[PDB]
A paper describes a structure:
For catalysis, CYPs required electrons typically supplied by redox proteins, such as ferredoxins. Here, we explored the genome context for two ferredoxins, Fdx and FdxE, determined the binding kinetics between FdxE and [name], and solved three crystal structures: Fdx, [name], and a complex FdxE–[name].
To visualize structural changes in [name] induced by the interaction with FdxE we solved the [name] structure alone at similar resolution (1.4 Å). [name] structure is conforming to the typical cytochrome [name] fold with 12 α-helices (A–L) and 4 β-sheets. In the absence of the ligand, protein crystallized in open conformation with the heme cofactor accessible to the bulk solvent. The iron of the heme is hexacoordinated by the invariant Cys342 and a water molecule. This water is stabilized by the H-bond with glycerol molecule from a cryoprotectant solution. Superposition of the [name] structure with the [name] part of the complex structure shows RMSD = .932Å for all atoms and reveals a different position of the lower part of the meander. The relocation distance of 5.5 Å is observed for the Gly327 Ca atom. A closer examination of the interacting regions of [name] reveals a different side chain conformation of the charged residues involved in intermolecular contacts with Fdx in a complex structure Gln99 of the C helix, and Arg266 of the K helix. The local proximal area involved in the interaction with FdxE is positively charged, despite overall theoretical pI = 6.8.
Author numbering: 9 to 393
The structure:
């Protein structure tokens, strides 16, 4: 029998502020396909992973190519074959082995940021560390002036806040303009005087990227690759603050910190859904969606679906295997997944090395702002002696 009765929920009502497990369970139990505020949400593992793996049918470009004549969103908003070329070009720069060479530098800068905090006996971990750490390391990785961090964070925040909004303010437009001008100058310089950095090297070789391609990639990294890590830092420190024995076991334990970070990305993925638009009719859960349907693939829900011991609502350090789709799946799987793991494991290890014992401030209940453009904690007040 076919499915003619589409479930509908109001997104803003999902019980998501306090516990993402309750929120995703509410959505998952509404059905395999759930219509919320213009989009068809695919909630079940079999459909989500098949859809992520089928770019011909579930297009990223149709969901993510901006209107007007913007910079190309390389590679997020491309489908094969163009996407395949982009990922082939970028893969070597983002591999675990390539990024491992940056580790002494990233570690040095992480230690410095922790140094400035540890003597206070308190911090608000989002404003004081999580919101700053990703851009600091980005400047280090890509060879940008360290003194530009304040301006760049301001620009990033303004651009993220204004995206997909009908009436941008004059301050928003100016911030977008200043960021674009700043990045344009940087890429042009790297094309004329290439160094042994990524943004220089991608513009040289047998198949190089154009200036406009590197400009679009640079914008995408800033808008997509930084706040995601910020969010994950907050959840990492929250769980450590309220689990003393886990904290103690993880200190000076890179093997177990790796596992912990996988659990944080599994359970609180910073981008819990991926948008696509269908290119032809498809049947999911017995229900046929016409061509051109806007869908959202629910990776965070799938990560919690209970189908095995690695997909529960609990933080699970045990078990031989840890696996998940918090970095997505299929060909668009997070280009920066290896960098995110490096940065998060580095932050946890170095935090524990200088601040092994800490706790949540009194009467603090962790929540996200929901609905909003962020799945990050609103704030995270920490205390230590
Ligand atoms: C915990 C941190 C992160 C999470 C949870 C995350 C999550 C994701 C997800 C789910 C996707 C797939 C989106 C889709 O299929 O439409 C994605 C793509 C991407 N991410 Fe991340 N990300 C993180 C960190 C980073 C970092 C650190 C970088 C680089 C600095 C980065 C750069 C990218 C890029 C360029 C893509 C597009 C890849 C493509 O379309 O082929 N991300 N990310
Ligand atoms: Cl406080």
């Amino acid at each position: 029998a076919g499915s003619f009765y589409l479930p509908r929920l109001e997104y803003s009502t999902l019980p998501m502020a306090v516990d993402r497990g309750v929120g995703w369970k509410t959505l998952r139990d509404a059905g395999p396909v759930v219509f919320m505020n213009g989009w068809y949400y695919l909630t079940r593992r079999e459909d989500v992973l098949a859809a992520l793996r089928n770019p011909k049918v579930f297009s990223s470009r149709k969901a993510l190519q901006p209107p007007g004549n913007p910079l190309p969103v390389v590679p997020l908003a491309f489908d094969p074959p163009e996407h395949t070329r982009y990922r082939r070009i970028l893969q070597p720069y983002f591999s675990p082995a390539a990024l491992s060479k940056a580790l002494p530098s990233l570690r040095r800068h992480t230690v410095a940021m922790i140094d400035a905090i540890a003597g206070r006996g308190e911090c608000e971990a989002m404003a004081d560390l999580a919101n700053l750490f990703p851009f600091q390391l980005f400047l280090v990785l890509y060879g940008l002036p360290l003194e530009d961090r304040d301006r760049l964070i301001g620009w990033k925040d303004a651009v993220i806040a204004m995206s997909d909004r009908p009436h941008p303010t004059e301050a928003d437009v100016a911030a977008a303009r200043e960021l674009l001008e700043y990045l344009t100058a940087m890429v042009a310089e790297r094309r004329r005087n290439p160094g042994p950095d990524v943004l220089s090297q991608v513009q040289i070789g047998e198949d190089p990227l154009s200036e406009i391609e590197v400009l679009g990639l640079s914008h995408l990294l800033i808008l997509a690759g930084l706040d995601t890590v910020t969010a994950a830092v907050g959840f990492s420190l929250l769980e450590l603050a309220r689990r003393p024995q886990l904290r103690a076991m993880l200190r000076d334990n890179p093997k177990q910190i790796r596992v912990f970070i996988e659990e944080i990305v599994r359970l609180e993925p910073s981008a819990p859904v991926a948008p696509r638009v269908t290119t032809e009719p498809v049947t999911v859960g017995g229900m046929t969606l016409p061509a051109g349907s806007p869908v959202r693939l629910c990776m965070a829900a799938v990560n919690r679906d209970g189908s095995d011991a690695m997909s529960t609502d609990e933080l699970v350090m045990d078990g031989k295997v840890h696996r998940h789709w918090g970095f997505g799946g299929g060909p668009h799987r997070c280009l920066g997944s290896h960098l995110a793991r490096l940065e998060l494991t580095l932050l946890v290890g170095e935090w524990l090395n200088q601040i092994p014992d800490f706790e949540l401030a009194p009467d603090y209940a962790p929540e996200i702002r929901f609905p909003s453009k962020s799945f990050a904690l609103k704030n995270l007040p920490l205390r230590w002696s």
